[PDB]
Amino acid sequence: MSLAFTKTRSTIGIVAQPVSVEVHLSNGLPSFTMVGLAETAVKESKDRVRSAIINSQFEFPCRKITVNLGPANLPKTGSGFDLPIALGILAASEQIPLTNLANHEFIGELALSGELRGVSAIIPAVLAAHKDNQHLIIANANAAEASLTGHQKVFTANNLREVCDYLCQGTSLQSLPPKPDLLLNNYELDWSDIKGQQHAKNAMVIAACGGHSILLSGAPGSGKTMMAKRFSTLLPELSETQALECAAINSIRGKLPDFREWRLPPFRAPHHTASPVALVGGGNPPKPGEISLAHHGVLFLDELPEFNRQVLETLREPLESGHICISRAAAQIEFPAKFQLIAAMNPCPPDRISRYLAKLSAPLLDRIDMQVTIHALSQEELIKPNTHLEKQSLAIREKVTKMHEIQMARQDSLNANLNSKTCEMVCELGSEEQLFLREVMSKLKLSARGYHRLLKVSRTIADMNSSKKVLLNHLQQALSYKQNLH
Amino acid sequence: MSLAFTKTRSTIGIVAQPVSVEVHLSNGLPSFTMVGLAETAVKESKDRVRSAIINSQFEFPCRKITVNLGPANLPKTGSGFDLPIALGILAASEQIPLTNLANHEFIGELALSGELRGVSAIIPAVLAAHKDNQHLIIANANAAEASLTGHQKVFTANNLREVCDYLCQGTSLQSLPPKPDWSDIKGQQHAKNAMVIAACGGHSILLSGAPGSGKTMMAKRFSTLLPELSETQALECAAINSIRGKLPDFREWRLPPFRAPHHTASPVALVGGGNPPKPGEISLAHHGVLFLDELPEFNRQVLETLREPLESGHICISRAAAQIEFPAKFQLIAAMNPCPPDRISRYLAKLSAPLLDRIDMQVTIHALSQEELIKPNTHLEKQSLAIREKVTKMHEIQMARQDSLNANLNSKTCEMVCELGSEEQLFLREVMSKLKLSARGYHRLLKVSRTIADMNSSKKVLLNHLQQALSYKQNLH
Amino acid sequence: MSLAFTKTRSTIGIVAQPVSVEVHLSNGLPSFTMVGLAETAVKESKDRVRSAIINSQFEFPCRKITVNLGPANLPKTGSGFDLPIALGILAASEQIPLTNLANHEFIGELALSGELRGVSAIIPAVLAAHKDNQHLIIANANAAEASLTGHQKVFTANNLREVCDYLCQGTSLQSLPPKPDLLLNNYELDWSDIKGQQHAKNAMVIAACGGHSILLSGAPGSGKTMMAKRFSTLLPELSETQALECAAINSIRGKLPDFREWRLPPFRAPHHTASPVALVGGGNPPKPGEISLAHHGVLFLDELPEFNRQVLETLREPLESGHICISRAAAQIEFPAKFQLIAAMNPCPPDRISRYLAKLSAPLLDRIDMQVTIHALSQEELIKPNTHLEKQSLAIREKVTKMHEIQMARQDSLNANLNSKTCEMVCELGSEEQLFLREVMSKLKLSARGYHRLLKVSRTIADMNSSKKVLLNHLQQALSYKQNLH
Amino acid sequence: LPDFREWRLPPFRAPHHTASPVALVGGGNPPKPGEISLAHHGVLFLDELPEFNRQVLETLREPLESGHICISRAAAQIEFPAKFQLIAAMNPCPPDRISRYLAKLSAPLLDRI
Ligand SMILES: Nc1ncnc2c1ncn2[C@@H]1O[C@H](COP(=O)(O)OP(=O)(O)NP(=O)(O)O)[C@@H](O)[C@H]1O
């Protein structure tokens, strides 16, 4: 009397639902029955698994094989269930040490020969396996795709016999390949570049250290895009989970989604024309928009006012929710879309000014926390090279990490996501600072949101100098990052 | 003799219809036949049940097994029938004494090892079992979801052998494990003043004003003004939640739900549900608050359907051969924009049908002045609790007068309760001369006046109360 | 060992995905259990292969047979699997030396006499076999269709016994037909048919030069569809890299009589009623829509306002990327649709004008680059006959080839495919040009997208004028092709 | 059956203008009496008459005159009694737009009112 239990994943989409494979060997006539809403693609696993076991010089039981793909309420649309089933059968026949199986998760499609074949949609599987801290074994054909995850806890095999010998004799199998070291280091940006615009640089630094969204404004060719691409270097390095989640969102796009290196916080910048289906959602099938590839990264609304107002209105959903459900029909998918927003606008040179600025999305413009002006450096100043830049990016990055730790000490929310109650409770806002606020806002006719965003920015620059309490100088300097338009 | 009975439950919508699985062992060549309308997930239970019985060291009968899970006309879809069928087979073979399972219900799907596995959407079955005064044995994995009832007799087990020993020798199963703001809105004055009596009287309210001025903030705050849900109401809310497969919060099941649907307004997601039906956004707000953010942006059709449950408390939806109620009692809140001519005329023409006209109350929000915006939160004295006590006593007196709130008063009842003495009648005609309110406008004015009259703890309505009530009217312009 | 492999090709859409046929012999009771998603083979091929093997005097195995058709997640429908399965069975029974199959593909269906029959849709298999550098053996009847590819290493046997002899004895089996030649002669249509429409002709020619999308407007009967019908002859001749792709796309629908016009670009002009499924994508196993036939070619859409809005919404994806990636929610098919788009419309017949203009698709108009108003011919111009027979179409085609060759000697895209930044750095645009362009943009409310479109048209016309840089004269000339609607 | 006390009171029905032809009249695949049939021996109320679609109003003629509706599944024909009394409501709105608005009213249902 014996039975075996084996674990695998069904990749119905971004999520990887855990699935338990169970085999029981009755002493009845040698049938092979499958339960658990097995589709045709998997209900036909019988003969292929049988031949794979036979052709690997194992013994196929002459007994009533019963297979259960739990849970029974969800259909098994995947195809990689074959290797878990074969391993379960071999374990039930006591040809394998059952003790080792408890810690391992298996995915694999086997040809009739017993050699493995690579299934599709493996990135969500490895993400889920890592989050569950399970040793994952997959077909060698998917090692190239698995490599971009940067794991050290995933193993690949060429044939079922190799998996059996790793289980028994500990052959350790072929691990996934080396690091993608074939790249240009420092992302060719690092920091300490951009010779001019000192004020814009430290404004960007404080925005990065916090979580504030910042809108750039200036003349063409003076800045914007350069600072935007440089910003990605200041954000702290992604943990394993964030990198794997970015890989999962990239993977559903199909193919090898992009061999543009990895593990850095993604920068996305859709063109202002684009489309509502490409920026957000997936339309008829479940796909993530560019808003979602920016998850744990930066979304750059390059030339903001040319965007469609409806898309900008939609953008307000996940920026606060953290995900944007796509209620297409009869079902929906989450697709997390939390990102550090950055925007760029051109002031242009009468009625024309209002007629142009009327296209600005007021709800999104009000949500954007920071604004700074970019001056042109003129053709005369660009001739002189960088002249001893003395790269210092690591200090600023560690400052970012320490600042985020300081935020987490109070609450998980960064200063940009603070509500009014928590914001007011955090800034001690002494008597003199209160009088200063009343004076300056008597001077400047701000609204409620303008007042609260000012408080949040002031608190951020207060944390810039390790001050438990805000001071008048902090608010005075933070005041320079507001007063939209003219 | 070789016949057995076992009660269980099947879920279709909110109601957990009773199901009697019946096992008869014949004497012919062994076979496993199942009868009664069953989705293939149910007729696939043969192998799971056989393996579970075998691996639990019982004896699987070598006889004709006929399983009837009646009634025959009701289709069975749930995966939970594995445990009832296993217990029926064990009882029919007399391995388990029959008398022990008389007043019990079994729910759970079986893995091959005989371990019980958690099924989805269990809570309605728990409620039905409690109502029918039956013991309910469930898989251990469902203990977390069933924990939001505090009920006894809900003993849960990990594997089949535990249940077998419990029935045979009485070994105790595991009991179910025990259970684990209005502030700010600076200086808004009139808006919160109106919203307080709106909560008191269950009235629907429409807020007008510029966006980004506290409308959503106050709407979210409105949730804690309502009283805590009773035990039955909280249980029903947990039941409707359990259909969509989540109960991750705790500490909050007693508070009324709050939902803010998006203006995209996909019909099948906002209301009702396709396939085996699922609760919509409207039904998730049961006993709670439904906030129609940006009312004019909604399409006509969804709100036209929504008018019916607003007046009836339920939204009937049906497949070809079914009929589902899906209770949807909720409180309505909506928002609109005053606009800065023909453009404003078409804007107000584009409003969402005569659903706005039967909204009970309306209030115009004005932007905060700067000085109250300065005022630090040194005025943080609690205010939610006292207003909740007011509201609780208010529902108490309103229910004592009649079995409904002032919002749900029928035509004759409101005129019978709102006495409107000669002094008040002498006034109403002059404002019916300054204005041209419809019959329903007059009636909702009367309901609001009655609510305010209660607010002053008055047995009768007075002229001052009607004058105060008149301010919270005059929808649009 | 009772194991054999046999590679082959199957196609959905244009791509001919590789498929590995696997045959395993077992000692159990005689049966033919085919596995892998098969719609016709699973129930028809297992019968034909038996008779084909028997009647060719081979020994059919008196043993259990399991046949695995490659990737299990990919549904397969081509009938030509009979020959691969038969050869797999023969190799598994060691009546054929399995070592010789290492570098070959097989395609064809077997009659009961062992004779091969011509399979449908052979061309994509030939293309895939060549690019994979694989010897391809096909039915004799398919020689005429495969011949247009002209590739070596292709053999067309008559019967299974001939293939067995070639594998065992290496006899020269069959060379390909002797490469039918085109010797292109147009002999039809020609640009000379367009009497009197000087402006429309020059606009049409420079639109061909720049690959721009062009919209025709004006009174009916001015020659709208005639312009489109004659446009195709001005495009450059398709190379084999393009001609083979177009032939593969066309063969998917049915028949292929192109031969002499086989290298000319194709032209489609669907009527506005149509149906979305026939015009784009298709049911059944995926079939190509009316859009995909215009690949590498031209698509004409007269009566644009009368199209149902679904078509005009969906056309954005292929018009941008050259592919549609249509999906059935089970799989997605790329279905390339690289084309040049020509539109035609009547500019309105009161608020009826407002409704008529509102029914226009802005997302399609947004990248409609060229617009020209065509009047009805004048009477005195209509009096004159043709009076000359110079076939100027060839000269215009030569001009188009020259312009496209120079553009490809520049960056890898034509003016039409240039983005904003590439369009910026391509054109010199001295100070006088910039200031005059700013002045004209002040005089009429063109957007930045219209600004870039005008710059693209100006670059095209300047290149046509043999000018090294864009001048103010070229901007003045290009301005006439704008001001859509009154 | 909410019955035994109020059953003898003649039925009342008020279908919404959205509804569905298959549920308002007859029933798909397994036959089931439509919402028109429930008003039998009672009153059927049609608020906002013009907003109904043409096909349903065309089919309304058959039960009004014959007292019954026959639904055909092409395998057999099934009769559902539909003798009822009809009450309708409509309203004009602010020009010749009034003329085209009233033109939407179904001609052969209106003359049977
Ligand atoms: N009276 C007030 N007291 C305190 N904070 C307020 C008040 N009015 C507005 N706010 C602030 O305004 C923000 C929320 O405004 P609110 O308009 O309710 O949300 P919203 O998302 O902007 N609704 P919408 O305009 O549709 O986007 C929060 O930062 C609140 O702190």
The CB density around residue A58, as the number of other CB atoms within 10 Å, is: 19
Distance separating alpha carbons of residues D79 and B191, to the nearest angstrom:
59
**A123, A157, A170: which is closest to A52 by C-alpha?**
A157
Question: What is the residue-wise DSSP string for B260-291?
Answer: ---TT--HHHHS--SSS----HHHHTTTEEEE
**A207, A222, A191, A189: which is closest to A373 by C-alpha?**
A222
For the Cβ of B260 lying below 6 angstroms from any atom of ligand 1, the answer is no
**B275, B278, B326, B270: which is closest to B301 by C-alpha?**
B270
C44's tokens: 């028809």
End-to-end CA distance of chain D: 32
DSSP code, position C336: B
Coil/strand/helix, residue C307 = coil
For the Cβ of A452 lying below 6 angstroms from any atom of ligand 1, the answer is yes
CB crowding C183-196: b at 16 or more within 10 Å, else e = eeeeeeeebeebeb
For the Cβ of B140 lying below 6 angstroms from any atom of ligand 1, the answer is no
Distance separating alpha carbons of residues B71 and D23, to the nearest angstrom:
26
Query: Are B297 and D14 within 8 A, CB to CB?
Result: no
> Containing H/E element for A433?
helix A431-443
Instruction: Give the technique used to solve this structure.
Output: cryo-EM
Residues 6+ apart with CB under 8 A from C246: C238, C266, C295, C296, C297
C323's tokens: 């592919």
For residue A363, how far is its CA from the centre of ligand 1 (angstroms)?
Answer: 11
The beta strand positions in A143-266, using DSSP E, are 154-157, 174-175, 214-218
Provide the residue type at B134 as one letter: Q
For residue B293, how far is its CA from the centre of ligand 1 (angstroms)?
Answer: 13
The beta strand positions in C99-247, using DSSP E, are 104-106, 109-110, 116-117, 135-139, 154-157, 214-218
List, in sequence order, the alpha helices (H) in A350-430.
351-357, 362-367, 378-381, 393-410, 420-426
C122's tokens: 């052979």
Distance separating alpha carbons of residues A423 and A453, to the nearest angstrom:
10
The CB density around residue A32, as the number of other CB atoms within 10 Å, is: 16
D63's tokens: 């039960």
Cross-chain Cβ contact B269/A438 below 8 Å: no
Distance separating alpha carbons of residues A139 and A152, to the nearest angstrom:
16
The CB density around residue C29, as the number of other CB atoms within 10 Å, is: 7
Query: Are B143 and B267 within 8 A, CB to CB?
Result: no
Query: Are B142 and B156 within 8 A, CB to CB?
Result: yes
Coil/strand/helix, residue A65 = strand
Question: What is the residue-wise DSSP string for C316-327?
Answer: HHHHHHSB--EE
Cross-chain Cβ contact C3/A306 below 8 Å: no
Radius of gyration of chain C (CA): 28
Distance separating alpha carbons of residues B270 and B282, to the nearest angstrom:
6
**B363, B361, B212: which is closest to B294 by C-alpha?**
B212
Residues 6+ apart with CB under 8 A from B145: B118, B122, B123, B242, B247
The beta strand positions in C12-63, using DSSP E, are 16-26, 32-35
Query: What are the backbone dihedrals phi and psi of residue B456, each rounded to the nearest 5 degrees, phi first?
Result: -85, 10
Query: What are the backbone dihedrals phi and psi of residue B141, each rounded to the nearest 5 degrees, phi first?
Result: -60, -25
| CA nearest to C4 within chain A | A113
C37's tokens: 């998603």
Coil/strand/helix, residue B112 = coil
Residues 6+ apart with CB under 8 A from C135: C103, C104, C105, C129, C153, C154, C155
For the Cβ of B337 lying below 6 angstroms from any atom of ligand 1, the answer is no
For the Cβ of B210 lying below 6 angstroms from any atom of ligand 1, the answer is no
Minimal CA separation from D87 to chain B, in Å: 20
C20 pairs with which residues across the strands? C7
Q: Is the peptide bond before A265 cis (omega within 30 degrees of 0)?
A: no
Query: Are B68 and B21 within 8 A, CB to CB?
Result: yes
The pairing of strands B64-70 and B15-25 is antiparallel
The burial class, CB within 10 Å (0-12 / 13-18 / 19+), for A33 is: middle
C158's tokens: 């008559």
Residues from A in contact with C at Cβ < 8 Å:
40-41, 44, 46-48, 50-51, 54-55, 79, 109, 111-113, 117, 119-120, 254, 271, 273, 275, 284-285, 303, 306
C15's tokens: 């791509």
For residue B218, how far is its CA from the centre of ligand 1 (angstroms)?
Answer: 8
Distance separating alpha carbons of residues C122 and C126, to the nearest angstrom:
7
Provide the residue type at B310 as one letter: L
A92's tokens: 């039930």
Q: In the sheet that C16-26 helps form, which strands lie side by side, from edge to edge?
A: C3-11, C16-26, C64-69, C32-35
List, in sequence order, the alpha helices (H) in A132-235.
143-147, 160-169, 198-209, 225-231
CB crowding A249-272: b at 16 or more within 10 Å, else e = bbbbeeeebeeeebbbbbbbbbeb
**A188, A227, A238, A182: which is closest to A391 by C-alpha?**
A188
Residue among A51, A117, A306 minimizing CB distance to C66: A51
The burial class, CB within 10 Å (0-12 / 13-18 / 19+), for B367 is: middle
List, in sequence order, the alpha helices (H) in A143-197.
143-147, 160-169
Radius of gyration of chain A (CA): 28
Radius of gyration of chain D (CA): 16
| CA nearest to A285 within chain C | C329
Provide the residue type at A262 as one letter: W
Q: Sort out which chain B residues have CB atoms less than 8 A from A366's CB and list them.
A: 212
Distance separating alpha carbons of residues B333 and B207, to the nearest angstrom:
8
DSSP code, position C76: B
Q: Do chains C and B touch (3 or more CB pairs under 8 A)?
A: no
Distance separating alpha carbons of residues B135 and B126, to the nearest angstrom:
9
Can you tell me which residue has the tokens 């970019």? A374
Pocket test for ligand 1, best of A365, A449, A451 (most atoms within 8 A of CB): A449
End-to-end CA distance of chain A: 83
**B76, B200, B84: which is closest to B137 by C-alpha?**
B84
Distance separating alpha carbons of residues B423 and B427, to the nearest angstrom:
7
Mutation site, D1, D13, D16, interface B, largest B CB count within 10 A: D16
Radius of gyration of chain B (CA): 28
**A316, A26, C48, A185: which is closest to B211 by C-alpha?**
A316
The pairing of strands A370-374 and B361-364 is unpaired
A47's tokens: 């003969």
Alpha-carbon separation of residue B73 from B3, B4, B69, B321 (angstroms)? 22, 21, 10, 10
**C215, C362, C434: which is closest to A273 by C-alpha?**
C362
C195's tokens: 């009497």
Cross-chain Cβ contact A44/C366 below 8 Å: no
Residues 6+ apart with CB under 8 A from A386: A192, A193, A195
Residue C6: left if φ>0, alpha if ψ -120 to 50, beta else—which one? beta
The CB density around residue A331, as the number of other CB atoms within 10 Å, is: 14
The burial class, CB within 10 Å (0-12 / 13-18 / 19+), for C165 is: middle
> Containing H/E element for A100?
helix A98-101
**A6, A17, A88, A3: which is closest to A49 by C-alpha?**
A88
Distance separating alpha carbons of residues B281 and B268, to the nearest angstrom:
9
With breaks defined as C to next N over 2.5 Å, after which residues does chain B break?
180, 340
Query: Cα dihedral sign for A427, A430, A432, A437?
Result: positive
Query: Cα dihedral sign for C439, C442, C448, C452?
Result: negative
Q: CA A46: distance to chain centroid? A: 38
Distance separating alpha carbons of residues A333 and A288, to the nearest angstrom:
10
Cross-chain Cβ contact A285/C23 below 8 Å: no
Alpha-carbon separation of residue C88 from A152, A214, C7, C20, C289 (angstroms)? 40, 65, 9, 10, 36
Task: Provide the Cα torsion C60, C64, C67, C72; round to 10°.
Answer: 170
Residue among B301, B305, B320 minimizing CB distance to D29: B320
Query: Are B21 and B85 within 8 A, CB to CB?
Result: yes
C164's tokens: 């067995």
Distance separating alpha carbons of residues C475 and A131, to the nearest angstrom:
60
List, in sequence order, the alpha helices (H) in A300-373.
309-321, 351-357, 362-367
Cross-chain Cβ contact B79/A66 below 8 Å: no
Q: Sort out which chain A residues have CB atoms less than 8 A from C20's CB and list them.
A: 111
Helix axes B384-401, B439-455, angle to 10 degrees: 120
Cross-chain Cβ contact C73/A51 below 8 Å: no
Alpha-carbon separation of residue C37 from B298, C42, C252 (angstroms)? 46, 8, 21
**B141, B105, B157, B101: which is closest to B126 by C-alpha?**
B105
Query: What are the backbone dihedrals phi and psi of residue A334, each rounded to the nearest 5 degrees, phi first?
Result: -80, -60
Question: What is the residue-wise DSSP string for B363-418?
Answer: EE--PPPHHHHH--GGG----HHHHHHHHHHHHHHHHHHSSS-GGG--HHHHHHH-
Query: Are C245 and C14 within 8 A, CB to CB?
Result: yes
Alpha-carbon separation of residue D98 from B355, D49, D110 (angstroms)? 24, 15, 17
**A169, A165, A146, A208: which is closest to A370 by C-alpha?**
A208
**A448, A473, A311, A300: which is closest to A366 by C-alpha?**
A448
For residue B211, how far is its CA from the centre of ligand 1 (angstroms)?
Answer: 8
Cross-chain Cβ contact A448/B214 below 8 Å: yes
Distance separating alpha carbons of residues C266 and C257, to the nearest angstrom:
13
Distance separating alpha carbons of residues A311 and A364, to the nearest angstrom:
10
Distance separating alpha carbons of residues B276 and A283, to the nearest angstrom:
24
The CB density around residue B341, as the number of other CB atoms within 10 Å, is: 8
For the Cβ of B217 lying below 6 angstroms from any atom of ligand 1, the answer is yes
Can you tell me which residue has the tokens 């009916």? C220
Coil/strand/helix, residue A6 = strand
Distance separating alpha carbons of residues A341 and B334, to the nearest angstrom:
30
Query: Are B83 and B110 within 8 A, CB to CB?
Result: yes
The CB density around residue A77, as the number of other CB atoms within 10 Å, is: 16
For residue A448, how far is its CA from the centre of ligand 1 (angstroms)?
Answer: 8
Distance separating alpha carbons of residues C315 and C319, to the nearest angstrom:
6
Count how many residues are written for chain B: 477
Query: Cα dihedral sign for A158, A161, A165, A166?
Result: positive
Ligand 1 atom 13, closest CA: B214
C134's tokens: 């694989």
The CB density around residue C245, as the number of other CB atoms within 10 Å, is: 19
Distance separating alpha carbons of residues C275 and C307, to the nearest angstrom:
10
Distance separating alpha carbons of residues A17 and A8, to the nearest angstrom:
9
Residues 6+ apart with CB under 8 A from A414: A210, A211, A404, A407
Cross-chain Cβ contact B112/A327 below 8 Å: no
Query: What are the backbone dihedrals phi and psi of residue B4, each rounded to the nearest 5 degrees, phi first?
Result: -145, 155
Q: What is the largest CA-CA distance in chain D?
A: 53
Distance separating alpha carbons of residues C306 and C359, to the nearest angstrom:
9
Helix axes B439-455, B463-471, angle to 10 degrees: 120
Can you tell me which residue has the tokens 């029938």? B81
Task: Provide the Cα torsion A414, A420, A424, A425; round to 10°.
Answer: -70
Cross-chain Cβ contact A47/C35 below 8 Å: yes
Residue among A54, A109, A271 minimizing CB distance to C72: A109
DSSP code, position B353: G
The pairing of strands C297-301 and C339-345 is parallel
The beta strand positions in C151-256, using DSSP E, are 154-157, 214-218
DSSP code, position B177: P
Residues from B in contact with D at Cβ < 8 Å:
301, 304-305, 308, 320-321
The burial class, CB within 10 Å (0-12 / 13-18 / 19+), for C267 is: buried
Distance separating alpha carbons of residues A176 and A135, to the nearest angstrom:
13
Distance separating alpha carbons of residues B215 and A449, to the nearest angstrom:
13
Can you tell me which residue has the tokens 């279908």? D15
C70's tokens: 């490659």
C115 pairs with which residues across the strands? C159
Distance separating alpha carbons of residues A315 and A361, to the nearest angstrom:
11
Can you tell me which residue has the tokens 């209620």? A327
Q: How many CB pairs under 8 A join A and B?
A: 101
For residue A275, how far is its CA from the centre of ligand 1 (angstroms)?
Answer: 30
